[PDB]
Amino acid sequence: MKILITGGAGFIGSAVVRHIIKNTQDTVVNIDKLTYAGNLESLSDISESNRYNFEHADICDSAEITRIFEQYQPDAVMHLAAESHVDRSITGPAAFIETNIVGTYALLEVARKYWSALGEDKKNNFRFHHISTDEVYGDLPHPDEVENSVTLPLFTETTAYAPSSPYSASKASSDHLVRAWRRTYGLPTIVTNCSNNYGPYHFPEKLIPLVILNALEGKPLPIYGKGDQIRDWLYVEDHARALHMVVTEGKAGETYNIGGHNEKKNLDVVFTICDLLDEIVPKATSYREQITYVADRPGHDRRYAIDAGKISRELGWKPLETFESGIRKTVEWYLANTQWVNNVKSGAYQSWIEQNYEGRQ
Amino acid sequence: MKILITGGAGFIGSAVVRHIIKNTQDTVVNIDKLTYAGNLESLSDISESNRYNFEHADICDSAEITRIFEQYQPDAVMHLAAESHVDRSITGPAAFIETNIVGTYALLEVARKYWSALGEDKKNNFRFHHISTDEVYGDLPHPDEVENSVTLPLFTETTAYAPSSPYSASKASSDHLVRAWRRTYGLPTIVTNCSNNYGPYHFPEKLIPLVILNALEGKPLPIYGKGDQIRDWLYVEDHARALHMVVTEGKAGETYNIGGHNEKKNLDVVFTICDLLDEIVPKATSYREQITYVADRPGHDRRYAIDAGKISRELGWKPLETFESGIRKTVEWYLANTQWVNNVKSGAYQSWIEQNYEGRQ
Ligand SMILES: NC(=O)c1ccc[n+]([C@@H]2O[C@H](COP(=O)([O-])OP(=O)(O)OC[C@H]3O[C@@H](n4cnc5c(N)ncnc54)[C@H](O)[C@@H]3O)[C@@H](O)[C@H]2O)c1
Ligand SMILES: NC(=O)c1ccc[n+]([C@@H]2O[C@H](COP(=O)([O-])OP(=O)(O)OC[C@H]3O[C@@H](n4cnc5c(N)ncnc54)[C@H](O)[C@@H]3O)[C@@H](O)[C@H]2O)c1
Ligand SMILES: Cc1cn([C@H]2C[C@H](O)[C@@H](COP(=O)(O)OP(=O)(O)O[C@H]3O[C@H](CO)[C@@H](O)[C@H](O)[C@H]3O)O2)c(=O)[nH]c1=O
Ligand SMILES: Cc1cn([C@H]2C[C@H](O)[C@@H](COP(=O)(O)OP(=O)(O)O[C@H]3O[C@H](CO)[C@@H](O)[C@H](O)[C@H]3O)O2)c(=O)[nH]c1=O
């Protein structure tokens, strides 16, 4: 099967591309604009395969995207291209509106026109898989707000949308466009929403990769507020396996939440990383001494937790890693990949760091 | 109080403007781009008031909208500007994405920067009222799908979003942006969602005004599908009164559904209009003979019904009209305003009619 993938040069996208080339018989055409987050070095292991092709383009460029669909004649689409950092969306929302909302719209239109003109056979098998986030569901009650006995709620596929930030509002909107295109034109679409991902090739602006690298460089480990906020952690390779399973066996018009059932508090995750480094790369003092409490993120969601029961009983997917096994692999990966880290950290990166952390709030 | 209103030259907007000038002590600055749907003639009774000012502009023009906010120093905002026809959104969705989503984004940003720089007093009292639709909630179970005993569900403020068309997806997205701006930056926003409006100054593309005018011209009365679909009808003047009540007494961060609790089937509404005309403007044959069944609307939602309990018990709002009293006033209004009707029906209007109705589906 020929799969057209948007955002394949990013964190989760590159994991999807590497998995398809190494473990399946499918082919791939990767469309990526290569923003600060797009890095071809993340696809080094497979860039030479004859079953892989790369196209440097913007999903907002209709004419070029149309040309690409006609040339490769994809059997399915996996849309991962997007602006993904909440902190960047707070100070610079325009890019999120343009890429996440208008960009999805532009891609849906090219796909609709393409799909409508396909032969009976290929037309019935076509699939448009939209990769999304759990953040569209809003915030959940926190352990310190309820009775130490009551069972805390989780995010399910029928939970109401209530996005808190420009980023999550962006994604929630893209989700609506995908489902409306299905109801109005008949486009066979699928939507997935998953929890926080972590692991190899993660850009150094998200919690885990930022903390690991700052620790090794002797810099502060910035905790927003008290660090009691909770997140559900899923190893990126597990997400990749689930995604290929969905685009291949998923049912048109369905939604699947993806996660690993691993609620953890931020501060706890930072301590775990510090203990791992104290063990592997010991020094005069403990890495914990670099931990610093800074001004909280505006509108910060205090707790995310996914209920992946549905995809489990319907597609039979289960994560292979545990947070414990995955977090150690992540730390080891960064220690062994300084070359990749140095190539991703540019002058632009340092500008973002100064903007978001120095003289913070 | 100085109120800045977007889309004040349209159907619902002009009703809001006329109500404020005639029945309150507030002032108004009206911003409207004057699309096919904008009509200054709908504001003839108040365009000369010194408490009213008009600005011909596009909400996407940040520089000009910024200048307008600084000149009039509004105390509140009522955002009604938008592309509102589902049928137009099916064939030309681009305009809906641009005006409804990107336009709301642009307006939210100008309002945020304006609000943040206000004095302590005026800053705490500022209000950004977003006027929206019930269609963001998706479709509801229809009487012919359930047990003739079970109570049919209604739309409440906690119903999950599930838009079916490009139009409703557009509005659902604008809703998310408004709430996220509130959670992230603290902007005091309010959101209202109401059922189908009908009454004076309604553009001839929606069911009721289209049926009334076509009947009088001896043209067909087009029924999509079987005409068994259901809608909740609210007289436009009742909506206007509710809206001024919300922007004035509504609580920041709250949502209020607005309706009249009047579920009616389309075919039944058409028969009602026909009997009213047979009575008032009798002719050789009955107007019923012009009723014609045509190809259904793609993705058509079969039933909408609002539960306005909340706004009723919290703000004390109730509709003054009944569908019976309001529908007669509507028919009488069109018979007495042929001047307005002739000015709104242009060559562009006829092009839309040919496009949507001749050789239909
Ligand atoms: N990070 C997570 O834990 C997580 C969880 C659930 C969902 N998601 C979703 O997964 C997808 C990828 O996330 P990452 O993998 O987290 O993102 P990322 O920031 O690492 O990469 C985004 C990628 O998209 C590309 N891109 C951005 N704008 C583009 C445009 N206009 N045209 C083409 N390419 C463009 C970038 O160049 C980059 O390769 C997103 O849609 C995101 O919402 C992320
Ligand atoms: N008609 C209904 O039953 C109903 C019900 C619920 C909600 N609403 C909402 O009420 C609002 C107004 O509906 P109508 O009153 O039904 O709409 P309308 O179609 O009659 O008028 C829209 C108005 O907005 C203006 N406009 C369009 N794009 C603009 C832009 N970019 N900048 C400035 N002005 C622009 C038009 O010139 C016009 O005067 C909409 O936001 C709609 O979603 C309508
Ligand atoms: C960057 C950073 C983050 N944090 C906290 C805030 C959050 O509670 C937690 C994780 O923050 P982030 O890495 O930015 O991730 P988060 O906002 O949860 O969102 C991620 O996970 C989402 C899915 O849950 C994805 O849709 C997003 O694209 C992805 O970026 O760590 C800090 O305390 N300090 C920091 O410096
Ligand atoms: C135009 C037209 C409509 N209809 C039917 C389809 C619908 O079930 C019903 C009403 O159609 P419309 O007048 O287009 O309205 P509808 O789609 O319900 O949407 C309206 O009501 C919405 C709120 O419910 C608003 O948000 C929209 O802006 C407004 O345009 O009548 C016909 O049978 N024939 C027609 O020619």
PDB file of N, CA and C and ligand atoms in Angstrom, chain B residues 12 82-87 96 132-136 155 165 167-168 171 194-197 202 204-211 214 221-233 266-267 270 292 294-297 300-304 306 352 356-357 360, ligand 4:
ATOM      1  N   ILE B  12     -30.018  39.099  11.979  1.00  0.00           N
ATOM      2  CA  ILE B  12     -30.061  39.195  13.435  1.00  0.00           C
ATOM      3  C   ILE B  12     -29.370  40.455  13.949  1.00  0.00           C
ATOM      4  N   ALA B  82     -20.542  36.987  10.117  1.00  0.00           N
ATOM      5  CA  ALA B  82     -20.244  35.631   9.660  1.00  0.00           C
ATOM      6  C   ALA B  82     -20.929  35.255   8.350  1.00  0.00           C
ATOM      7  N   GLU B  83     -20.492  34.137   7.772  1.00  0.00           N
ATOM      8  CA  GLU B  83     -21.108  33.570   6.569  1.00  0.00           C
ATOM      9  C   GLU B  83     -22.086  32.593   7.230  1.00  0.00           C
ATOM     10  N   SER B  84     -23.382  32.725   6.965  1.00  0.00           N
ATOM     11  CA  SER B  84     -24.368  31.884   7.650  1.00  0.00           C
ATOM     12  C   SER B  84     -25.176  30.812   6.925  1.00  0.00           C
ATOM     13  N   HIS B  85     -24.977  30.625   5.624  1.00  0.00           N
ATOM     14  CA  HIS B  85     -25.793  29.639   4.914  1.00  0.00           C
ATOM     15  C   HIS B  85     -25.149  28.278   4.660  1.00  0.00           C
ATOM     16  N   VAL B  86     -25.710  27.246   5.286  1.00  0.00           N
ATOM     17  CA  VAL B  86     -25.218  25.881   5.129  1.00  0.00           C
ATOM     18  C   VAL B  86     -25.068  25.491   3.659  1.00  0.00           C
ATOM     19  N   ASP B  87     -26.091  25.753   2.847  1.00  0.00           N
ATOM     20  CA  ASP B  87     -26.020  25.398   1.432  1.00  0.00           C
ATOM     21  C   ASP B  87     -24.863  26.081   0.703  1.00  0.00           C
ATOM     22  N   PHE B  96     -16.201  30.476   4.501  1.00  0.00           N
ATOM     23  CA  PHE B  96     -16.589  30.172   5.873  1.00  0.00           C
ATOM     24  C   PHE B  96     -15.377  29.995   6.776  1.00  0.00           C
ATOM     25  N   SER B 132     -23.344  32.678  18.625  1.00  0.00           N
ATOM     26  CA  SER B 132     -23.198  31.449  17.845  1.00  0.00           C
ATOM     27  C   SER B 132     -24.508  30.676  17.600  1.00  0.00           C
ATOM     28  N   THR B 133     -24.381  29.459  17.068  1.00  0.00           N
ATOM     29  CA  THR B 133     -25.525  28.626  16.692  1.00  0.00           C
ATOM     30  C   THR B 133     -25.659  27.274  17.400  1.00  0.00           C
ATOM     31  N   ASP B 134     -26.862  26.706  17.361  1.00  0.00           N
ATOM     32  CA  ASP B 134     -27.117  25.409  17.984  1.00  0.00           C
ATOM     33  C   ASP B 134     -26.542  24.264  17.149  1.00  0.00           C
ATOM     34  N   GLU B 135     -26.221  24.550  15.892  1.00  0.00           N
ATOM     35  CA  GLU B 135     -25.700  23.532  14.990  1.00  0.00           C
ATOM     36  C   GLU B 135     -24.353  22.937  15.381  1.00  0.00           C
ATOM     37  N   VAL B 136     -23.651  23.584  16.308  1.00  0.00           N
ATOM     38  CA  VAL B 136     -22.355  23.078  16.750  1.00  0.00           C
ATOM     39  C   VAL B 136     -22.536  21.770  17.520  1.00  0.00           C
ATOM     40  N   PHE B 155     -30.884  19.928  23.192  1.00  0.00           N
ATOM     41  CA  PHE B 155     -29.538  20.498  23.264  1.00  0.00           C
ATOM     42  C   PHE B 155     -29.392  21.293  24.566  1.00  0.00           C
ATOM     43  N   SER B 165     -21.670  20.143   9.034  1.00  0.00           N
ATOM     44  CA  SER B 165     -21.325  20.831   7.795  1.00  0.00           C
ATOM     45  C   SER B 165     -20.153  21.797   7.917  1.00  0.00           C
ATOM     46  N   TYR B 167     -20.172  24.881   7.481  1.00  0.00           N
ATOM     47  CA  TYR B 167     -20.670  26.028   8.233  1.00  0.00           C
ATOM     48  C   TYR B 167     -20.623  25.759   9.744  1.00  0.00           C
ATOM     49  N   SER B 168     -21.298  24.707  10.209  1.00  0.00           N
ATOM     50  CA  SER B 168     -21.312  24.439  11.645  1.00  0.00           C
ATOM     51  C   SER B 168     -19.928  24.104  12.207  1.00  0.00           C
ATOM     52  N   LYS B 171     -18.333  27.501  12.873  1.00  0.00           N
ATOM     53  CA  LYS B 171     -18.826  28.128  14.089  1.00  0.00           C
ATOM     54  C   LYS B 171     -18.338  27.407  15.334  1.00  0.00           C
ATOM     55  N   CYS B 194     -28.134  29.678  19.693  1.00  0.00           N
ATOM     56  CA  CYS B 194     -29.584  29.639  19.540  1.00  0.00           C
ATOM     57  C   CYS B 194     -30.084  28.871  18.322  1.00  0.00           C
ATOM     58  N   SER B 195     -31.379  28.585  18.336  1.00  0.00           N
ATOM     59  CA  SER B 195     -32.040  27.854  17.267  1.00  0.00           C
ATOM     60  C   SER B 195     -32.292  28.755  16.056  1.00  0.00           C
ATOM     61  N   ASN B 196     -32.964  28.211  15.042  1.00  0.00           N
ATOM     62  CA  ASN B 196     -33.278  28.956  13.819  1.00  0.00           C
ATOM     63  C   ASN B 196     -34.085  30.229  14.087  1.00  0.00           C
ATOM     64  N   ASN B 197     -33.658  31.343  13.500  1.00  0.00           N
ATOM     65  CA  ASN B 197     -34.365  32.609  13.651  1.00  0.00           C
ATOM     66  C   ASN B 197     -35.215  32.850  12.404  1.00  0.00           C
ATOM     67  N   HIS B 202     -35.231  39.195   6.878  1.00  0.00           N
ATOM     68  CA  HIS B 202     -34.534  37.932   6.653  1.00  0.00           C
ATOM     69  C   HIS B 202     -34.174  37.817   5.163  1.00  0.00           C
ATOM     70  N   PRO B 204     -33.780  36.366   1.645  1.00  0.00           N
ATOM     71  CA  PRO B 204     -34.509  35.343   0.877  1.00  0.00           C
ATOM     72  C   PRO B 204     -33.807  34.039   0.488  1.00  0.00           C
ATOM     73  N   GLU B 205     -32.827  33.582   1.265  1.00  0.00           N
ATOM     74  CA  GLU B 205     -32.151  32.327   0.928  1.00  0.00           C
ATOM     75  C   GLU B 205     -32.479  31.236   1.948  1.00  0.00           C
ATOM     76  N   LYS B 206     -32.999  31.644   3.101  1.00  0.00           N
ATOM     77  CA  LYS B 206     -33.376  30.700   4.153  1.00  0.00           C
ATOM     78  C   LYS B 206     -34.823  30.233   3.913  1.00  0.00           C
ATOM     79  N   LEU B 207     -35.174  29.065   4.447  1.00  0.00           N
ATOM     80  CA  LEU B 207     -36.501  28.475   4.249  1.00  0.00           C
ATOM     81  C   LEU B 207     -37.713  29.414   4.209  1.00  0.00           C
ATOM     82  N   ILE B 208     -38.040  30.021   5.345  1.00  0.00           N
ATOM     83  CA  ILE B 208     -39.205  30.890   5.436  1.00  0.00           C
ATOM     84  C   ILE B 208     -39.266  32.084   4.480  1.00  0.00           C
ATOM     85  N   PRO B 209     -38.225  32.934   4.444  1.00  0.00           N
ATOM     86  CA  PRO B 209     -38.348  34.055   3.500  1.00  0.00           C
ATOM     87  C   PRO B 209     -38.322  33.612   2.036  1.00  0.00           C
ATOM     88  N   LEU B 210     -37.659  32.493   1.754  1.00  0.00           N
ATOM     89  CA  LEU B 210     -37.611  31.981   0.385  1.00  0.00           C
ATOM     90  C   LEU B 210     -38.993  31.473  -0.025  1.00  0.00           C
ATOM     91  N   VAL B 211     -39.645  30.748   0.878  1.00  0.00           N
ATOM     92  CA  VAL B 211     -40.963  30.196   0.601  1.00  0.00           C
ATOM     93  C   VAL B 211     -42.030  31.279   0.444  1.00  0.00           C
ATOM     94  N   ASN B 214     -41.235  33.179  -2.982  1.00  0.00           N
ATOM     95  CA  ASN B 214     -41.466  32.316  -4.141  1.00  0.00           C
ATOM     96  C   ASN B 214     -42.972  32.104  -4.339  1.00  0.00           C
ATOM     97  N   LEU B 221     -41.954  25.833  -4.358  1.00  0.00           N
ATOM     98  CA  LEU B 221     -41.581  25.908  -2.947  1.00  0.00           C
ATOM     99  C   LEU B 221     -40.820  24.593  -2.756  1.00  0.00           C
ATOM    100  N   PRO B 222     -39.477  24.643  -2.855  1.00  0.00           N
ATOM    101  CA  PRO B 222     -38.558  23.504  -2.729  1.00  0.00           C
ATOM    102  C   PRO B 222     -38.369  22.857  -1.363  1.00  0.00           C
ATOM    103  N   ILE B 223     -38.833  21.613  -1.246  1.00  0.00           N
ATOM    104  CA  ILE B 223     -38.723  20.841  -0.013  1.00  0.00           C
ATOM    105  C   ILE B 223     -37.580  19.824  -0.136  1.00  0.00           C
ATOM    106  N   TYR B 224     -36.545  19.964   0.691  1.00  0.00           N
ATOM    107  CA  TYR B 224     -35.420  19.026   0.671  1.00  0.00           C
ATOM    108  C   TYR B 224     -35.869  17.671   1.233  1.00  0.00           C
ATOM    109  N   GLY B 225     -35.715  16.602   0.455  1.00  0.00           N
ATOM    110  CA  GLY B 225     -36.118  15.288   0.933  1.00  0.00           C
ATOM    111  C   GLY B 225     -37.621  15.190   1.145  1.00  0.00           C
ATOM    112  N   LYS B 226     -38.036  14.683   2.304  1.00  0.00           N
ATOM    113  CA  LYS B 226     -39.456  14.532   2.607  1.00  0.00           C
ATOM    114  C   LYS B 226     -40.050  15.697   3.383  1.00  0.00           C
ATOM    115  N   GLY B 227     -39.191  16.583   3.878  1.00  0.00           N
ATOM    116  CA  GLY B 227     -39.678  17.721   4.630  1.00  0.00           C
ATOM    117  C   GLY B 227     -40.117  17.337   6.026  1.00  0.00           C
ATOM    118  N   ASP B 228     -39.616  16.204   6.510  1.00  0.00           N
ATOM    119  CA  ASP B 228     -39.955  15.735   7.847  1.00  0.00           C
ATOM    120  C   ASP B 228     -38.894  16.166   8.862  1.00  0.00           C
ATOM    121  N   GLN B 229     -37.871  16.874   8.390  1.00  0.00           N
ATOM    122  CA  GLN B 229     -36.817  17.356   9.279  1.00  0.00           C
ATOM    123  C   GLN B 229     -37.424  18.383  10.237  1.00  0.00           C
ATOM    124  N   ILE B 230     -36.848  18.475  11.433  1.00  0.00           N
ATOM    125  CA  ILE B 230     -37.344  19.358  12.484  1.00  0.00           C
ATOM    126  C   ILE B 230     -36.404  20.499  12.906  1.00  0.00           C
ATOM    127  N   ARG B 231     -36.987  21.675  13.138  1.00  0.00           N
ATOM    128  CA  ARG B 231     -36.254  22.870  13.555  1.00  0.00           C
ATOM    129  C   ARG B 231     -36.988  23.589  14.696  1.00  0.00           C
ATOM    130  N   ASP B 232     -36.232  24.286  15.539  1.00  0.00           N
ATOM    131  CA  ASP B 232     -36.776  25.037  16.677  1.00  0.00           C
ATOM    132  C   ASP B 232     -36.804  26.494  16.212  1.00  0.00           C
ATOM    133  N   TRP B 233     -37.996  27.074  16.091  1.00  0.00           N
ATOM    134  CA  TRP B 233     -38.127  28.447  15.598  1.00  0.00           C
ATOM    135  C   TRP B 233     -38.259  29.558  16.633  1.00  0.00           C
ATOM    136  N   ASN B 266     -40.481  20.929   8.748  1.00  0.00           N
ATOM    137  CA  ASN B 266     -40.408  21.848   7.618  1.00  0.00           C
ATOM    138  C   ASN B 266     -41.697  21.888   6.781  1.00  0.00           C
ATOM    139  N   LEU B 267     -42.169  20.725   6.336  1.00  0.00           N
ATOM    140  CA  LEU B 267     -43.381  20.663   5.521  1.00  0.00           C
ATOM    141  C   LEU B 267     -44.554  21.356   6.214  1.00  0.00           C
ATOM    142  N   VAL B 270     -44.269  25.056   5.860  1.00  0.00           N
ATOM    143  CA  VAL B 270     -44.622  25.496   4.518  1.00  0.00           C
ATOM    144  C   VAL B 270     -46.147  25.550   4.349  1.00  0.00           C
ATOM    145  N   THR B 292     -43.028  21.610  -3.958  1.00  0.00           N
ATOM    146  CA  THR B 292     -42.295  20.647  -4.780  1.00  0.00           C
ATOM    147  C   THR B 292     -41.177  19.941  -4.022  1.00  0.00           C
ATOM    148  N   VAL B 294     -37.687  18.149  -3.811  1.00  0.00           N
ATOM    149  CA  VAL B 294     -36.435  18.159  -4.575  1.00  0.00           C
ATOM    150  C   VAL B 294     -35.352  17.342  -3.866  1.00  0.00           C
ATOM    151  N   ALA B 295     -34.216  17.136  -4.531  1.00  0.00           N
ATOM    152  CA  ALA B 295     -33.114  16.359  -3.951  1.00  0.00           C
ATOM    153  C   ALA B 295     -32.677  16.916  -2.593  1.00  0.00           C
ATOM    154  N   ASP B 296     -32.487  16.016  -1.636  1.00  0.00           N
ATOM    155  CA  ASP B 296     -32.111  16.374  -0.275  1.00  0.00           C
ATOM    156  C   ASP B 296     -30.732  17.025  -0.158  1.00  0.00           C
ATOM    157  N   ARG B 297     -30.518  17.736   0.946  1.00  0.00           N
ATOM    158  CA  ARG B 297     -29.245  18.406   1.201  1.00  0.00           C
ATOM    159  C   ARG B 297     -28.250  17.374   1.720  1.00  0.00           C
ATOM    160  N   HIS B 300     -27.588  16.449   5.602  1.00  0.00           N
ATOM    161  CA  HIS B 300     -28.695  17.134   6.286  1.00  0.00           C
ATOM    162  C   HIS B 300     -28.953  16.662   7.724  1.00  0.00           C
ATOM    163  N   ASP B 301     -28.967  17.591   8.679  1.00  0.00           N
ATOM    164  CA  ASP B 301     -29.262  17.241  10.071  1.00  0.00           C
ATOM    165  C   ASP B 301     -30.783  17.154  10.155  1.00  0.00           C
ATOM    166  N   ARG B 302     -31.291  16.045  10.677  1.00  0.00           N
ATOM    167  CA  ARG B 302     -32.728  15.837  10.733  1.00  0.00           C
ATOM    168  C   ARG B 302     -33.515  16.456  11.878  1.00  0.00           C
ATOM    169  N   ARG B 303     -32.844  16.864  12.954  1.00  0.00           N
ATOM    170  CA  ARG B 303     -33.561  17.474  14.076  1.00  0.00           C
ATOM    171  C   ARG B 303     -32.740  18.305  15.066  1.00  0.00           C
ATOM    172  N   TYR B 304     -33.178  19.547  15.279  1.00  0.00           N
ATOM    173  CA  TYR B 304     -32.555  20.462  16.237  1.00  0.00           C
ATOM    174  C   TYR B 304     -33.641  20.845  17.245  1.00  0.00           C
ATOM    175  N   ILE B 306     -33.649  23.108  21.131  1.00  0.00           N
ATOM    176  CA  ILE B 306     -32.943  23.743  22.238  1.00  0.00           C
ATOM    177  C   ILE B 306     -33.658  23.699  23.589  1.00  0.00           C
ATOM    178  N   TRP B 352     -27.303  32.673  -7.439  1.00  0.00           N
ATOM    179  CA  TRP B 352     -27.278  31.694  -6.355  1.00  0.00           C
ATOM    180  C   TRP B 352     -28.463  30.743  -6.501  1.00  0.00           C
ATOM    181  N   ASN B 356     -28.088  26.690  -6.839  1.00  0.00           N
ATOM    182  CA  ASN B 356     -28.568  25.748  -5.829  1.00  0.00           C
ATOM    183  C   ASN B 356     -29.856  24.985  -6.171  1.00  0.00           C
ATOM    184  N   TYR B 357     -30.719  25.567  -7.004  1.00  0.00           N
ATOM    185  CA  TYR B 357     -31.991  24.918  -7.326  1.00  0.00           C
ATOM    186  C   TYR B 357     -32.239  24.324  -8.713  1.00  0.00           C
ATOM    187  N   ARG B 360     -30.820  20.649  -9.713  1.00  0.00           N
ATOM    188  CA  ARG B 360     -30.394  20.269  -8.372  1.00  0.00           C
ATOM    189  C   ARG B 360     -30.067  18.790  -8.193  1.00  0.00           C
TER     190      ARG B 360
HETATM  191  C1  LIG C   4     -33.135  26.735   2.077  1.00  0.00           C
HETATM  192  C2  LIG C   4     -34.027  25.513   2.206  1.00  0.00           C
HETATM  193  C3  LIG C   4     -34.069  24.839   3.355  1.00  0.00           C
HETATM  194  N1  LIG C   4     -34.860  23.704   3.564  1.00  0.00           N
HETATM  195  C4  LIG C   4     -34.847  23.021   4.869  1.00  0.00           C
HETATM  196  C5  LIG C   4     -33.496  22.507   5.349  1.00  0.00           C
HETATM  197  C6  LIG C   4     -33.537  22.669   6.856  1.00  0.00           C
HETATM  198  O1  LIG C   4     -33.977  21.499   7.533  1.00  0.00           O
HETATM  199  C7  LIG C   4     -34.576  23.767   7.047  1.00  0.00           C
HETATM  200  C8  LIG C   4     -33.986  25.134   7.353  1.00  0.00           C
HETATM  201  O2  LIG C   4     -32.922  25.402   6.396  1.00  0.00           O
HETATM  202  P1  LIG C   4     -32.130  26.792   6.411  1.00  0.00           P
HETATM  203  O3  LIG C   4     -32.985  27.985   6.336  1.00  0.00           O
HETATM  204  O4  LIG C   4     -31.113  26.764   5.339  1.00  0.00           O
HETATM  205  O5  LIG C   4     -31.515  26.834   7.905  1.00  0.00           O
HETATM  206  P2  LIG C   4     -30.542  25.897   8.690  1.00  0.00           P
HETATM  207  O6  LIG C   4     -29.708  25.047   7.837  1.00  0.00           O
HETATM  208  O7  LIG C   4     -31.377  25.118   9.624  1.00  0.00           O
HETATM  209  O8  LIG C   4     -29.545  26.967   9.423  1.00  0.00           O
HETATM  210  C9  LIG C   4     -30.024  28.219   9.943  1.00  0.00           C
HETATM  211  O9  LIG C   4     -30.219  28.039  11.372  1.00  0.00           O
HETATM  212  C10 LIG C   4     -28.958  27.830  12.117  1.00  0.00           C
HETATM  213  C11 LIG C   4     -29.318  27.580  13.587  1.00  0.00           C
HETATM  214  O10 LIG C   4     -30.209  26.411  13.685  1.00  0.00           O
HETATM  215  C12 LIG C   4     -27.997  29.040  11.919  1.00  0.00           C
HETATM  216  O11 LIG C   4     -26.766  28.817  12.621  1.00  0.00           O
HETATM  217  C13 LIG C   4     -27.736  29.246  10.432  1.00  0.00           C
HETATM  218  O12 LIG C   4     -26.839  30.378  10.271  1.00  0.00           O
HETATM  219  C14 LIG C   4     -29.079  29.444   9.716  1.00  0.00           C
HETATM  220  O13 LIG C   4     -28.791  29.669   8.309  1.00  0.00           O
HETATM  221  O14 LIG C   4     -35.320  23.902   5.808  1.00  0.00           O
HETATM  222  C15 LIG C   4     -35.677  23.205   2.526  1.00  0.00           C
HETATM  223  O15 LIG C   4     -36.388  22.228   2.629  1.00  0.00           O
HETATM  224  N2  LIG C   4     -35.614  23.924   1.340  1.00  0.00           N
HETATM  225  C16 LIG C   4     -34.837  25.070   1.083  1.00  0.00           C
HETATM  226  O16 LIG C   4     -34.901  25.581  -0.020  1.00  0.00           O
END
